[PDB]
């Protein structure tokens, strides 16, 4: 038998349903989602980190001339100068007044320290959802990890359950993501091979151990000071460190709907948005005939306490009279009130106390109890606390 | 080195089995066939037998098998097997045989002793799979090369293993014999036996090479004597009773696992093409049944697939977008029309 | 798949029960009223009340490495190409991504190949690979296999060591005086699909897109156009007076 149901997208709350049959007893269903993940499909483009200015020892020739040989190191700058009078701690490295030539060559390489201290770029698309559910059908408790696409149901005890696609494909992530130190920021990083000096992306390395990088740091060599040996060089500071000083706040504290982002695998938790359609195919074995369930007679309901707070704050006692003693499920067809428990123990002439949540000042509604309808009416009062530490439990009707 | 490969099957013995059809009828045989596998392309098939090969009572080509508990050996070139035509035995190793012979419907395996012929036939399908798209019955002398799957010729430790089990109790009516008034039990030298009887009350006795007689029993048919062995495991055969307790003491590798190799595949004759305005005709003459696959190079292919085993005529239309076809195993041929 | 039969469990002249090993799609049954036989005559003495127990199961065959079928889901095809570009007699062969970014840089020249004008992909959402051939087939999803058709056995990987089987294995009454386990199940669906074997994508693809699978890919077929954007610096533009007129 096919049964369609709707699930609000919010973990931490229970949800009760009754499956009605004309000739058989109603069947209870209790569902509690424990954790929902919105995992994006992300690919890896490149990695960047601190760079280190490499240089070879200066090439000094005395009364002669030199030539530049290309090593093809990334962003290599090679230059030759003349008119130098070298010095050393022991004395004069030359006897020539002029014609001495110096060759200075410089380049960059990835800093050794950034095996872990590396910033990663990312491009994300086509987020998929994965929910962990606790199901109780026919008082059979099970915990399941289910896929919520248009296929891939789960089978247990013959019950088949399929959760349809999301009602909304919204994703907190933008196209272009940046990952660093377990923090995820939406940033518009430039693409491969088009970096600029001073900004994020002066260095471009495909992988951590690619050993093939493209660098654009605007490195410029300078005339060495007379009377000493060195290679003066100048380049813009690290765009990585400049972006580190900028550091706009995190998606962890700026994303809407209160999503919780985690970075072991990139994922978003408990994004409270939308609803999940679910379809039950229940075998006829679990369905119970009417004669096997107690039937009430002359039952009345009275409200003992009223607080229409966020939590369950309406307590009602039902005085009934039953031929048989057996557990059965109570249900509220309307959205006026939400019952807490899924079933209540039933004895031969006892009274059943039930807890529920409502937002109406003057509640009045009918309880389906296992064979019959019973009216229950009353007026109710506000709470005493202006703020609470848990979300809403019942819908707000017009 | 191969003795380290042979070492696994030094720990086991052959076993008698039931076979539904000896030369006489329903029968107990040493050459009962458990299973047959035929997945290789060139007709290479694997038989799982109840005997052992390559081990003497280490020798190259021999068959080691069982006779009422007594192990015997025969040269390998005496046994034969067939389905529709005489097959050819290549090599044997342990409980497995590799055979190469054409299609059929049943597998018969037989051999001849000095005066008694042993055989039986099992009806398990054997299938011959052609490679490519040229159906044949015997691989050609010449052609081209392709990659199909054939069964490897040599044994090596692969990732496929089987399970042995502790042998059960084997009843032997030969051991029991009638004395003047009692029943005489004579277990074989160096082996233990279990005698269980109900001639009087319940009886159970483990004899260890002891010729013991039991009172209160007059006839011999009332009760049974068994044989006990601890070493020399047996395969998990469905034709034997099991021992007592957990039935597991390791596993053995299975040789002759399939592999990839180079395959000879026939070549069809060249079809003679004749061209006309936006059309082509293929004068065609096949040696064996062969596949035509034809496609158009447009948004929709109108793909046509056809098996022809006789000379025929086909007229095809070609447009500027293009026509493509494969006959046999030739590289695909693409034709592109022109204005004229 | 390979049917694995346990050794027939005999307790003649007594009684037995079932011990589930929890192997995939295992079936355990108990039969009474058996008079088994062995080469050395009858096994035991009691005429009736003899209990056989037969346990049968299925395990992946030993030939699963070089003879197996894989099911894949395909979406968001990506295009790239190998170009040989000669501008200002500067000829280079280079790989380029024809997406809307990632220019190729040489001699100061930056070439951007924009996205494809058509999103046509020669693969359906589901595909099946087997022995270097690809077929667009609607295979049933994992866990919903049907006997006698594709997907009777479902293993997460070649060595997952855990499979879900739906082969409809049913035991039968053993023949009198014979130690054996008579079983019945539908033929494997993989060989039936092999018998069917509709023509492959490399012979039925539109636009003639040649399909090779070192990785699953398609090549050499004409659909649409590549927009090209040239970013040329001002240095390579030569004076006319320096050129023949």
């Amino acid at each position, epitope marked *: 038998y096919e049964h369609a149901t709707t699930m609000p997208s919010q973990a931490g709350i229970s949800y009760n349903t009754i499956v009605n049959r004309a000739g058989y007893a109603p069947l209870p269903i209790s569902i509690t989602p424990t954790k929902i993940k919105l*995992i*994006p*499909t*992300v*690919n*890896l483009e490149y990695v960047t980190c601190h760079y280190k200015t490499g240089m070879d020892s200066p090439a000094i020739k005395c009364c002669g001339s030199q030539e530049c040989t290309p090593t093809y190191r990334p962003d290599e700058q090679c230059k030759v100068f003349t008119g130098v009078y070298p010095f050393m701690w022991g004395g004069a490295y030359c006897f020539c007044d002029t014609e001495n030539t110096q060759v200075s060559k410089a380049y960059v390489m990835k800093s050794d320290d950034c095996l872990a201290d590396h910033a990663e770029a990312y491009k994300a698309h086509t987020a*998929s959802v994965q929910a962990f559910l606790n199901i109780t059908v026919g008082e059979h408790s099970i915990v399941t990890t289910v896929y919520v696409n248009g296929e891939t149901p789960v089978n247990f005890n013959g019950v088949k359950i399929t959760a349809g696609p999301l009602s909304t494909a919204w994703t907190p992530f933008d196209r272009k993501i940046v990952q660093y130190a377990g923090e995820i920021y939406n940033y518009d990083f430039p693409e491969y091979g088009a970096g600029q000096p001073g900004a994020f992306g002066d260095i471009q390395s495909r*992988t951590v*151990s690619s050993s093939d990088l493209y660098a654009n740091t605007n490195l410029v060599l300078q005339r060495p000071k007379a009377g000493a040996i060195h290679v003066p060089y100048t380049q813009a500071p690290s765009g990585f460190e400049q972006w580190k000083k900028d550091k706009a706040p995190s998606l962890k504290f700026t994303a809407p709907f209160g999503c919780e982002i985690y970075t072991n*695998p990139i994922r978003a938790e408990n994004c409270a948005v939308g609803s999940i359609p679910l379809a039950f195919d229940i075998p006829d074995a679990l369905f119970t005939r009417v004669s096997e369930t107690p039937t009430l007679s002359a039952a009345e309901c009275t409200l003992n306490e009223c607080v229409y707070s966020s939590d369950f704050g309406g307590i009602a006692t039902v005085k009934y009279s039953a031929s048989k003693s057996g557990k059965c499920a109570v249900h509220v067809p309307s959205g006026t009130a939400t019952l807490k428990e899924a079933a209540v123990e039933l004895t031969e002439q006892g009274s059943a106390t039930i807890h529920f949540s409502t937002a109406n000042i003057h509640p009045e509604f009918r309880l389906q109890i296992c064979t019959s309808y019973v009216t229950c009416k009353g007026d109710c009062h506000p709470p005493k606390d202006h703020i609470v530490t848990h979300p809403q439990y019942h819908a707000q009707t017009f | 080195s191969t003795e380290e490969l042979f070492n696994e099957y030094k720990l086991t013995r052959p076993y008698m089995a039931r076979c539904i059809r000896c030369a006489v009828g329903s029968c107990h045989s040493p050459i009962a066939i458990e299973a047959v596998k035929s997945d290789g392309h060139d007709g290479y098939v694997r038989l799982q037998t109840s005997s052992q090969y390559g081990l003497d009572s280490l020798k190259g080509r021999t068959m080691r098998y069982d006779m009422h508990g007594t192990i015997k050996e025969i040269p390998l070139h005496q046994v034969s097997l067939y389905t529709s035509r005489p097959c050819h035995i290549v090599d044997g190793h342990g409980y497995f045989l590799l055979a190469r012979c054409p299609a059929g419907d049943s597998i018969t395996m037989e051999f001849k002793k000095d005066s008694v012929r042993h055989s039986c036939s099992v009806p398990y399908e054997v299938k011959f799979n052609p490679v490519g798209r040229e159906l044949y019955t015997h691989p050609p002398e010449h052609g081209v090369e392709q990659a199909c799957q054939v069964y490897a010729h*040599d044994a*090596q430790n*692969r*990732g*496929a293993y089987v399970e042995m089990h502790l042998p059960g109790s084997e009843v032997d009516s030969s051991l029991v014999s009638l004395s003047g008034s009692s029943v005489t039990v004579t277990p074989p030298d160096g082996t233990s036996a279990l005698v269980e009887c109900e001639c009087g009350g319940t009886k159970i006795s483990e004899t260890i090479n002891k010729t013991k007689q039991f009172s209160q029993c007059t006839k011999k048919e009332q009760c049974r004597a068994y044989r006990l062995q601890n070493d020399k495991w047996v395969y998990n055969s469905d034709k034997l009773p099991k021992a007592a307790g957990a039935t597991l003491k390791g596993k053995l590798h299975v040789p002759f*696992l399939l*592999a*990839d*190799g*180079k395959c000879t595949v026939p070549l069809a004759p060249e079809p003679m093409i004749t061209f006309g305005f936006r059309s082509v005709s293929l004068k065609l003459h096949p040696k064996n049944p062969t596949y035509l696959i034809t496609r158009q190079l447009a948004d929709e292919p109108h793909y046509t697939h056809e098996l022809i085993s006789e000379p025929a005529v086909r007229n095809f239309t070609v447009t500027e977008k293009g026509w493509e076809f494969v006959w046999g195993n030739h590289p695909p041929k693409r034709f592109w029309a022109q204005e004229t | 798949y390979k049917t694995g039969m346990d050794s027939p469990a005999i307790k003649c002249c007594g009684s037995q029960e079932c011990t589930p090993t929890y192997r995939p799609d295992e079936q355990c049954k108990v039969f009474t009223g058996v008079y088994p036989f062995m080469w050395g005559g009858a096994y035991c003495f009691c005429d009736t009340e003899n209990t056989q127990v037969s346990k049968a199961y299925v395990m992946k065959s030993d030939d*699963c*490495l*070089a003879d197996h079928a*894989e099911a*894949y*889901k395909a*979406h968001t095809a990506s295009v790239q190409a190998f170009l040989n570009i000669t501008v200002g007699e500067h000829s280079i062969v280079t790989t380029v991504y024809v997406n809307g970014e990632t220019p190729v840089n040489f001699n100061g020249v930056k070439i951007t190949a924009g996205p494809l004008s058509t999103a046509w992909t020669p693969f359906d959402r589901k595909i099946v690979q087997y022995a270097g051939e690809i077929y667009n087939y609607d295979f049933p999803e994992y866990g919903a296999g049907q006997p006698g058709a594709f997907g009777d056995i479902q293993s997460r*990987t*070649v*060595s997952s060591s855990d499979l879900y089987a739906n082969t409809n294995l049913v035991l039968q009454r053993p023949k009198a005086g014979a130690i054996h386990v008579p079983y019945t199940q539908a033929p494997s669906g993989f060989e039936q699909w092999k018998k069917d074997k509709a023509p492959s994508l490399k012979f039925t693809a539109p636009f003639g897109c040649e399909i090779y*699978t*070192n*990785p*699953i890919r398609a090549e050499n077929c004409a659909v649409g156009s590549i927009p090209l954007a040239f970013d040329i610096p001002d240095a390579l533009f030569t004076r006319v007076s320096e050129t023949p007129t």
Partner: nanobody, 122 residues
Framework: EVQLQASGGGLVQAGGSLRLSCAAS????????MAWYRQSPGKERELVAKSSGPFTLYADSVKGRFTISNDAAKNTVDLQMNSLKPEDTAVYYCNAEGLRYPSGTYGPSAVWGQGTQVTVSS
């Protein structure tokens, strides 16, 4: 993006014993097909070894002289070479097929490493 890095090989005399190691790194959890391929100068690519879980395969000309071992925990494949012949001069590549990304953005199916050159001197 998963990549394969090859190591080992080098120069050796006839009859020597070497090792080749290929390692996979990236967003991968479980791997199915480990394979090795050799390409001599002037000839097309060919398979030499093929490992997948417990099973191992070998070609016709290479039986009894090469051994392949796979470590799924490290996602590495090691090829032990013994008693090499002058026909073995070629460049060896390591292949990975049937990659299972741990969601794990679905991506390219197969990947290829740079490979290593092996040369034996007569």
């Amino acid at each position: 993006e998963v990549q394969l890095q090859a190591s080992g090989g080098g120069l050796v005399q006839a009859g020597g014993s070497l090792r080749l190691s290929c390692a996979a790194s990236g967003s991968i959890v479980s791997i199915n097909v480990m394979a090795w391929y050799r390409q001599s100068p002037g000839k097309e690519r060919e398979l030499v070894a093929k490992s997948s879980g417990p099973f191992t395969l070998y070609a016709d000309s290479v039986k009894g002289r090469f051994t392949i071992s796979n470590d799924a925990a490290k996602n590495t494949v090691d090829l032990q070479m013994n008693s090499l012949k002058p026909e073995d001069t070629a460049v060896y590549y390591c292949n990975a097929e049937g990659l299972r990304y741990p969601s794990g953005t679905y991506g390219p199916s197969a990947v290829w490493g740079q490979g290593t050159q092996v040369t034996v001197s007569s």
